[PDB]
PDB file of C-alpha atoms and ligand atoms in Angstrom:
ATOM      1  CA  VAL V   1     -31.102  27.104 -10.161  1.00 56.95           C
ATOM      2  CA  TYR V   2     -28.921  24.686  -8.191  1.00 53.48           C
ATOM      3  CA  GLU V   3     -29.273  21.310  -9.868  1.00 56.23           C
ATOM      4  CA  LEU V   4     -27.343  18.043  -9.710  1.00 56.53           C
ATOM      5  CA  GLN V   5     -27.865  15.079 -12.026  1.00 55.84           C
ATOM      6  CA  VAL V   6     -26.411  11.806 -10.807  1.00 53.34           C
ATOM      7  CA  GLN V   7     -27.744   8.323 -10.093  1.00 50.47           C
ATOM      8  CA  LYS V   8     -28.501   7.711  -6.397  1.00 50.52           C
ATOM      9  CA  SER V   9     -26.837   4.324  -5.973  1.00 47.91           C
ATOM     10  CA  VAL V  10     -23.685   2.740  -7.441  1.00 49.02           C
ATOM     11  CA  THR V  11     -21.939  -0.652  -7.122  1.00 50.75           C
ATOM     12  CA  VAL V  12     -18.369  -1.805  -7.708  1.00 51.21           C
ATOM     13  CA  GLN V  13     -16.560  -5.031  -7.007  1.00 52.25           C
ATOM     14  CA  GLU V  14     -13.768  -4.420  -4.541  1.00 52.98           C
ATOM     15  CA  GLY V  15     -10.484  -3.842  -6.367  1.00 56.58           C
ATOM     16  CA  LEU V  16     -12.176  -2.714  -9.584  1.00 58.70           C
ATOM     17  CA  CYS V  17     -13.384   0.732 -10.626  1.00 56.46           C
ATOM     18  CA  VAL V  18     -16.488   2.510 -11.889  1.00 55.92           C
ATOM     19  CA  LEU V  19     -17.377   5.802 -13.535  1.00 59.55           C
ATOM     20  CA  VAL V  20     -20.134   7.853 -11.958  1.00 57.43           C
ATOM     21  CA  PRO V  21     -21.556  10.242 -14.570  1.00 56.51           C
ATOM     22  CA  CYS V  22     -22.479  13.576 -13.039  1.00 52.91           C
ATOM     23  CA  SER V  23     -23.634  17.024 -14.125  1.00 52.01           C
ATOM     24  CA  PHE V  24     -24.414  20.105 -12.061  1.00 52.78           C
ATOM     25  CA  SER V  25     -25.626  23.668 -12.393  1.00 54.52           C
ATOM     26  CA  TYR V  26     -25.584  26.877 -10.384  1.00 51.18           C
ATOM     27  CA  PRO V  27     -26.559  30.541 -10.883  1.00 48.10           C
ATOM     28  CA  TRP V  28     -23.853  32.523 -12.658  1.00 48.01           C
ATOM     29  CA  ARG V  29     -24.355  35.942 -14.267  1.00 49.07           C
ATOM     30  CA  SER V  30     -21.218  35.372 -16.423  1.00 52.95           C
ATOM     31  CA  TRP V  31     -19.696  38.872 -16.497  1.00 52.08           C
ATOM     32  CA  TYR V  32     -15.901  39.385 -16.510  1.00 50.16           C
ATOM     33  CA  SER V  33     -15.672  39.369 -12.693  1.00 48.29           C
ATOM     34  CA  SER V  34     -14.697  35.724 -12.949  1.00 47.96           C
ATOM     35  CA  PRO V  35     -13.562  34.178  -9.645  1.00 48.03           C
ATOM     36  CA  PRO V  36     -12.452  30.511  -9.794  1.00 50.65           C
ATOM     37  CA  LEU V  37     -14.890  27.612  -9.666  1.00 53.47           C
ATOM     38  CA  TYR V  38     -14.129  25.017  -6.988  1.00 52.06           C
ATOM     39  CA  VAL V  39     -16.019  21.770  -6.528  1.00 51.84           C
ATOM     40  CA  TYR V  40     -15.696  18.956  -4.011  1.00 52.98           C
ATOM     41  CA  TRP V  41     -16.987  15.550  -3.140  1.00 52.53           C
ATOM     42  CA  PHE V  42     -17.211  14.721   0.559  1.00 53.12           C
ATOM     43  CA  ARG V  43     -18.087  11.779   2.794  1.00 54.66           C
ATOM     44  CA  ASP V  44     -21.651  12.056   4.146  1.00 55.32           C
ATOM     45  CA  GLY V  45     -22.086  14.369   7.098  1.00 57.97           C
ATOM     46  CA  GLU V  46     -18.659  16.003   6.965  1.00 58.98           C
ATOM     47  CA  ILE V  47     -18.260  19.762   7.303  1.00 58.55           C
ATOM     48  CA  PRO V  48     -16.848  21.417   4.156  1.00 60.95           C
ATOM     49  CA  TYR V  49     -14.932  23.936   6.287  1.00 62.68           C
ATOM     50  CA  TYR V  50     -12.970  21.272   8.111  1.00 63.47           C
ATOM     51  CA  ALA V  51     -12.981  18.197   5.921  1.00 60.31           C
ATOM     52  CA  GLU V  52     -10.328  16.754   3.666  1.00 57.96           C
ATOM     53  CA  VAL V  53     -12.138  16.142   0.369  1.00 59.40           C
ATOM     54  CA  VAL V  54     -12.463  12.747  -1.225  1.00 60.49           C
ATOM     55  CA  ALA V  55     -11.974  14.675  -4.470  1.00 57.14           C
ATOM     56  CA  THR V  56     -11.653  18.297  -5.562  1.00 57.07           C
ATOM     57  CA  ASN V  57     -10.305  20.624  -8.246  1.00 56.22           C
ATOM     58  CA  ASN V  58      -9.111  23.059  -5.598  1.00 56.81           C
ATOM     59  CA  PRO V  59      -5.278  23.022  -5.592  1.00 58.38           C
ATOM     60  CA  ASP V  60      -5.118  24.284  -2.002  1.00 59.71           C
ATOM     61  CA  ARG V  61      -7.491  21.760  -0.520  1.00 56.76           C
ATOM     62  CA  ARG V  62      -6.057  18.682   1.166  1.00 54.65           C
ATOM     63  CA  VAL V  63      -7.355  15.344  -0.170  1.00 52.09           C
ATOM     64  CA  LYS V  64      -8.032  12.284   1.997  1.00 54.42           C
ATOM     65  CA  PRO V  65      -4.948  10.039   1.808  1.00 53.80           C
ATOM     66  CA  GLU V  66      -7.270   7.056   1.337  1.00 54.73           C
ATOM     67  CA  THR V  67      -8.853   8.485  -1.804  1.00 55.12           C
ATOM     68  CA  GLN V  68      -5.766  10.157  -3.272  1.00 52.65           C
ATOM     69  CA  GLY V  69      -5.430   8.678  -6.742  1.00 53.93           C
ATOM     70  CA  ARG V  70      -8.477   6.410  -6.537  1.00 55.49           C
ATOM     71  CA  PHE V  71     -11.210   9.057  -6.683  1.00 56.98           C
ATOM     72  CA  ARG V  72     -10.739  11.478  -9.515  1.00 55.04           C
ATOM     73  CA  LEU V  73     -12.845  14.150 -11.113  1.00 55.93           C
ATOM     74  CA  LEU V  74     -13.112  13.428 -14.829  1.00 54.44           C
ATOM     75  CA  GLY V  75     -14.160  15.947 -17.440  1.00 55.26           C
ATOM     76  CA  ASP V  76     -14.101  19.712 -17.286  1.00 50.83           C
ATOM     77  CA  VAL V  77     -15.695  21.118 -14.153  1.00 47.65           C
ATOM     78  CA  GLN V  78     -15.877  24.396 -16.102  1.00 45.54           C
ATOM     79  CA  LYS V  79     -18.320  22.513 -18.348  1.00 44.55           C
ATOM     80  CA  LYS V  80     -20.929  21.310 -15.813  1.00 44.03           C
ATOM     81  CA  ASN V  81     -19.145  17.975 -15.328  1.00 41.26           C
ATOM     82  CA  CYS V  82     -18.942  16.625 -11.757  1.00 40.93           C
ATOM     83  CA  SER V  83     -18.348  13.125 -13.031  1.00 40.36           C
ATOM     84  CA  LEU V  84     -16.540  10.966 -10.548  1.00 41.15           C
ATOM     85  CA  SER V  85     -14.191   8.074 -11.145  1.00 41.34           C
ATOM     86  CA  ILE V  86     -13.659   5.527  -8.386  1.00 39.26           C
ATOM     87  CA  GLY V  87     -10.736   3.158  -8.811  1.00 38.12           C
ATOM     88  CA  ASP V  88      -9.334   0.141  -6.966  1.00 39.76           C
ATOM     89  CA  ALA V  89     -12.561   0.134  -4.970  1.00 39.06           C
ATOM     90  CA  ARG V  90     -12.260  -0.736  -1.279  1.00 39.79           C
ATOM     91  CA  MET V  91     -14.878  -1.921   1.207  1.00 37.57           C
ATOM     92  CA  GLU V  92     -14.017   1.121   3.334  1.00 32.38           C
ATOM     93  CA  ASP V  93     -15.309   3.284   0.489  1.00 33.08           C
ATOM     94  CA  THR V  94     -18.854   2.027   0.991  1.00 32.49           C
ATOM     95  CA  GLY V  95     -21.082   4.826   2.212  1.00 34.23           C
ATOM     96  CA  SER V  96     -22.770   8.050   1.115  1.00 39.67           C
ATOM     97  CA  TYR V  97     -21.131  11.114  -0.524  1.00 38.56           C
ATOM     98  CA  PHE V  98     -22.088  14.655  -1.462  1.00 37.73           C
ATOM     99  CA  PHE V  99     -20.950  17.275  -3.943  1.00 37.84           C
ATOM    100  CA  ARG V 100     -20.355  20.942  -3.272  1.00 37.67           C
ATOM    101  CA  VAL V 101     -19.687  23.979  -5.404  1.00 35.68           C
ATOM    102  CA  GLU V 102     -18.116  27.274  -4.503  1.00 34.26           C
ATOM    103  CA  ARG V 103     -17.527  30.302  -6.672  1.00 37.54           C
ATOM    104  CA  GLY V 104     -17.033  33.801  -5.354  1.00 37.09           C
ATOM    105  CA  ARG V 105     -18.439  34.815  -1.974  1.00 38.25           C
ATOM    106  CA  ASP V 106     -21.978  34.296  -3.257  1.00 36.99           C
ATOM    107  CA  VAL V 107     -22.035  30.824  -4.813  1.00 37.80           C
ATOM    108  CA  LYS V 108     -21.617  28.137  -2.135  1.00 36.65           C
ATOM    109  CA  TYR V 109     -23.803  25.024  -2.056  1.00 33.33           C
ATOM    110  CA  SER V 110     -23.864  21.388  -0.949  1.00 33.47           C
ATOM    111  CA  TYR V 111     -26.170  19.061  -2.893  1.00 32.03           C
ATOM    112  CA  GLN V 112     -27.441  17.301   0.212  1.00 30.92           C
ATOM    113  CA  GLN V 113     -30.570  16.202  -1.653  1.00 31.78           C
ATOM    114  CA  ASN V 114     -28.601  14.375  -4.356  1.00 32.24           C
ATOM    115  CA  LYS V 115     -26.191  12.287  -2.227  1.00 33.27           C
ATOM    116  CA  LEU V 116     -24.299   9.404  -3.832  1.00 32.19           C
ATOM    117  CA  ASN V 117     -24.585   5.975  -2.289  1.00 30.42           C
ATOM    118  CA  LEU V 118     -21.734   3.630  -2.981  1.00 27.46           C
ATOM    119  CA  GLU V 119     -21.782  -0.089  -2.289  1.00 29.50           C
ATOM    120  CA  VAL V 120     -18.524  -2.025  -2.622  1.00 32.91           C
ATOM    121  CA  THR V 121     -19.334  -5.679  -3.315  1.00 34.04           C
ATOM    122  CA  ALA V 122     -16.820  -8.545  -3.228  1.00 31.53           C
ATOM    123  CA  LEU V 123     -14.598  -9.384  -6.207  1.00 29.89           C
ATOM    124  CA  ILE V 124     -16.114 -12.290  -8.146  1.00 31.74           C
ATOM    125  CA  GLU V 125     -14.690 -11.401 -11.563  1.00 28.68           C
ATOM    126  CA  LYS V 126     -11.846 -13.633 -12.753  1.00 31.04           C
ATOM    127  CA  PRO V 127      -8.750 -12.514 -14.700  1.00 31.06           C
ATOM    128  CA  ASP V 128      -8.631 -13.004 -18.466  1.00 31.68           C
ATOM    129  CA  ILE V 129      -6.398 -14.799 -20.974  1.00 31.73           C
ATOM    130  CA  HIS V 130      -6.548 -13.459 -24.546  1.00 33.42           C
ATOM    131  CA  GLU V 133      -6.549 -18.612 -31.464  1.00 36.19           C
ATOM    132  CA  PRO V 134      -3.231 -20.377 -32.362  1.00 37.25           C
ATOM    133  CA  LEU V 135      -2.133 -23.560 -30.516  1.00 35.45           C
ATOM    134  CA  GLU V 136       0.514 -25.239 -32.709  1.00 36.53           C
ATOM    135  CA  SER V 137       3.239 -27.498 -31.293  1.00 36.80           C
ATOM    136  CA  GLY V 138       6.212 -25.280 -32.103  1.00 35.26           C
ATOM    137  CA  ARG V 139       4.798 -21.765 -32.371  1.00 32.49           C
ATOM    138  CA  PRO V 140       5.712 -18.530 -30.491  1.00 32.34           C
ATOM    139  CA  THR V 141       2.225 -17.893 -29.081  1.00 33.23           C
ATOM    140  CA  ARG V 142       1.883 -15.033 -26.578  1.00 34.04           C
ATOM    141  CA  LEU V 143      -0.644 -14.948 -23.728  1.00 30.01           C
ATOM    142  CA  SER V 144      -2.022 -12.003 -21.751  1.00 29.87           C
ATOM    143  CA  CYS V 145      -3.597 -12.228 -18.292  1.00 31.64           C
ATOM    144  CA  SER V 146      -5.527  -9.016 -17.593  1.00 30.65           C
ATOM    145  CA  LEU V 147      -8.574  -8.169 -15.466  1.00 30.21           C
ATOM    146  CA  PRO V 148     -11.896  -6.580 -16.552  1.00 32.09           C
ATOM    147  CA  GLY V 149     -13.142  -3.446 -14.806  1.00 31.30           C
ATOM    148  CA  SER V 150      -9.592  -2.693 -13.667  1.00 28.27           C
ATOM    149  CA  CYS V 151      -7.955   0.754 -13.652  1.00 29.14           C
ATOM    150  CA  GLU V 152      -4.389   1.976 -13.384  1.00 31.81           C
ATOM    151  CA  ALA V 153      -5.707   3.795 -10.309  1.00 32.33           C
ATOM    152  CA  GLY V 154      -4.159   2.225  -7.230  1.00 32.20           C
ATOM    153  CA  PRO V 155      -0.764   0.434  -7.058  1.00 29.30           C
ATOM    154  CA  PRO V 156      -0.108  -1.875 -10.070  1.00 26.92           C
ATOM    155  CA  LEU V 157      -1.200  -5.523  -9.884  1.00 29.06           C
ATOM    156  CA  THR V 158       0.953  -8.606  -9.347  1.00 29.74           C
ATOM    157  CA  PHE V 159       0.745 -11.813 -11.417  1.00 29.26           C
ATOM    158  CA  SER V 160       2.081 -15.346 -10.944  1.00 25.81           C
ATOM    159  CA  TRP V 161       1.426 -18.233 -13.335  1.00 29.03           C
ATOM    160  CA  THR V 162       0.744 -21.788 -12.165  1.00 31.19           C
ATOM    161  CA  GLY V 163       0.718 -25.078 -14.059  1.00 33.17           C
ATOM    162  CA  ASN V 164       2.789 -28.089 -15.072  1.00 29.61           C
ATOM    163  CA  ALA V 165       3.562 -26.557 -18.466  1.00 29.14           C
ATOM    164  CA  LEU V 166       5.825 -23.872 -16.987  1.00 29.84           C
ATOM    165  CA  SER V 167       9.149 -25.720 -17.193  1.00 33.96           C
ATOM    166  CA  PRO V 168       9.715 -25.946 -21.003  1.00 33.97           C
ATOM    167  CA  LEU V 169      11.055 -22.375 -20.933  1.00 37.83           C
ATOM    168  CA  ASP V 170      12.161 -19.788 -18.356  1.00 40.37           C
ATOM    169  CA  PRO V 171      11.449 -20.962 -14.768  1.00 37.54           C
ATOM    170  CA  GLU V 172      11.170 -17.381 -13.517  1.00 33.68           C
ATOM    171  CA  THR V 173      10.029 -15.043 -16.315  1.00 34.75           C
ATOM    172  CA  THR V 174       6.399 -15.747 -15.439  1.00 34.21           C
ATOM    173  CA  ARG V 175       5.440 -12.565 -13.589  1.00 32.98           C
ATOM    174  CA  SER V 176       4.727 -10.422 -16.630  1.00 31.96           C
ATOM    175  CA  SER V 177       1.088  -9.795 -17.492  1.00 32.85           C
ATOM    176  CA  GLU V 178       1.761 -11.076 -20.997  1.00 32.61           C
ATOM    177  CA  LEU V 179       3.648 -14.331 -21.549  1.00 35.61           C
ATOM    178  CA  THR V 180       5.412 -15.684 -24.633  1.00 34.22           C
ATOM    179  CA  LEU V 181       5.435 -19.467 -24.956  1.00 35.42           C
ATOM    180  CA  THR V 182       5.968 -22.161 -27.575  1.00 34.87           C
ATOM    181  CA  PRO V 183       3.812 -25.137 -26.427  1.00 31.98           C
ATOM    182  CA  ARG V 184       6.057 -28.181 -26.283  1.00 30.61           C
ATOM    183  CA  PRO V 185       4.050 -31.372 -27.167  1.00 31.38           C
ATOM    184  CA  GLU V 186       3.848 -33.139 -23.768  1.00 29.83           C
ATOM    185  CA  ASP V 187       1.939 -30.050 -22.595  1.00 29.96           C
ATOM    186  CA  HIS V 188      -1.642 -30.933 -23.520  1.00 27.53           C
ATOM    187  CA  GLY V 189      -4.814 -30.498 -21.501  1.00 30.30           C
ATOM    188  CA  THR V 190      -2.760 -29.087 -18.638  1.00 30.16           C
ATOM    189  CA  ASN V 191      -4.414 -26.679 -16.200  1.00 32.03           C
ATOM    190  CA  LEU V 192      -2.794 -23.272 -16.684  1.00 33.28           C
ATOM    191  CA  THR V 193      -3.444 -20.641 -14.030  1.00 33.92           C
ATOM    192  CA  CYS V 194      -2.791 -16.942 -13.441  1.00 31.73           C
ATOM    193  CA  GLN V 195      -3.211 -15.452  -9.970  1.00 30.09           C
ATOM    194  CA  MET V 196      -3.290 -11.746  -9.181  1.00 32.45           C
ATOM    195  CA  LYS V 197      -3.014  -9.410  -6.199  1.00 37.29           C
ATOM    196  CA  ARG V 198      -2.980  -5.633  -5.769  1.00 36.01           C
ATOM    197  CA  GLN V 199       0.464  -5.602  -4.151  1.00 35.49           C
ATOM    198  CA  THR V 204      -6.074 -13.778  -4.328  1.00 30.53           C
ATOM    199  CA  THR V 205      -8.329 -14.460  -7.320  1.00 29.93           C
ATOM    200  CA  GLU V 206      -7.304 -16.525 -10.345  1.00 28.27           C
ATOM    201  CA  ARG V 207      -8.228 -18.042 -13.722  1.00 25.66           C
ATOM    202  CA  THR V 208      -7.517 -21.641 -14.758  1.00 22.26           C
ATOM    203  CA  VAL V 209      -7.695 -22.708 -18.414  1.00 22.21           C
ATOM    204  CA  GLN V 210      -7.074 -26.032 -20.172  1.00 22.33           C
ATOM    205  CA  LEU V 211      -4.370 -26.335 -22.798  1.00 23.09           C
ATOM    206  CA  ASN V 212      -4.839 -27.839 -26.257  1.00 22.61           C
ATOM    207  CA  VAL V 213      -2.072 -28.591 -28.749  1.00 24.96           C
ATOM    208  CA  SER V 214      -2.459 -29.705 -32.364  1.00 23.46           C
TER     209      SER V 214
HETATM  210  C1  SIA U   1     -27.214  29.928   0.675  1.00 26.88           C
HETATM  211  C2  SIA U   1     -26.592  28.945  -0.312  1.00 26.88           C
HETATM  212  O1  SIA U   1     -26.912  29.004  -1.499  1.00 26.88           O
HETATM  213  N1  SIA U   1     -25.702  28.062   0.142  1.00 26.88           N
HETATM  214  C3  SIA U   1     -25.703  27.640   1.532  1.00 26.88           C
HETATM  215  C4  SIA U   1     -25.519  26.123   1.634  1.00 26.88           C
HETATM  216  C5  SIA U   1     -26.626  25.384   0.870  1.00 26.88           C
HETATM  217  O2  SIA U   1     -27.841  26.116   0.944  1.00 26.88           O
HETATM  218  C6  SIA U   1     -26.845  23.980   1.431  1.00 26.88           C
HETATM  219  O3  SIA U   1     -25.606  23.297   1.506  1.00 26.88           O
HETATM  220  C7  SIA U   1     -27.807  23.194   0.550  1.00 26.88           C
HETATM  221  O4  SIA U   1     -27.940  21.873   1.053  1.00 26.88           O
HETATM  222  O5  SIA U   1     -25.515  25.726   3.029  1.00 26.88           O
HETATM  223  C8  SIA U   1     -24.442  26.316   3.789  1.00 26.88           C
HETATM  224  O6  SIA U   1     -24.545  25.881   5.100  1.00 26.88           O
HETATM  225  C9  SIA U   1     -23.122  25.846   3.187  1.00 26.88           C
HETATM  226  O7  SIA U   1     -22.962  24.623   2.986  1.00 26.88           O
HETATM  227  O8  SIA U   1     -22.243  26.695   2.921  1.00 26.88           O
HETATM  228  C10 SIA U   1     -24.518  27.846   3.733  1.00 26.88           C
HETATM  229  C11 SIA U   1     -24.568  28.336   2.284  1.00 26.88           C
HETATM  230  O9  SIA U   1     -24.768  29.741   2.258  1.00 26.88           O
END
């Protein structure tokens, strides 16, 4: 009667985020005596009674400062959803995790058989720049990053290149950038670095 559906292993590139689909079941008669349903995710081998949860829907339970905001329960727990969302992954997050349910004095249960193994790989993904290119046009660029979440603390950008003097010599921190390619700027390496408060992406210009 106590079942938990979730993949056993999961991978995420440090700094990015992933969504761990999860579903769970437990015996519940369903009559009006309806005490609240509290679920938790813990680090492997911790004791429910004394541990700060990595994630929970219990308003009284203290959450690990390290996971506050990065690990969040998605979906309605009242609808069998234990889906987890890990954001701004960190190497420290690597390890095993388990889910627990509690409802009334009777329902209490840790799914120690269905642990969740999380491996935090290194960040190899490169930012992105998203077809004009006319000498004298107000083209606007945008340097974002795939697999990113607005989980942790906002990212920081800084553009590099020789073609950064035609206009503002300081308004180049924004994610998006407006620029009118002045002629001389052709086949010039344009870069965009990023940090989470340092990977980059270099592209070659082309004016016509
Ligand atoms: C009897 C029951 O349904 N739940 C029991 C659970 C689960 O059997 C295990 O966590 C499964 O791994 O174990 C406990 O130690 C717990 O964590 O509270 C006692 C609790 O009564």
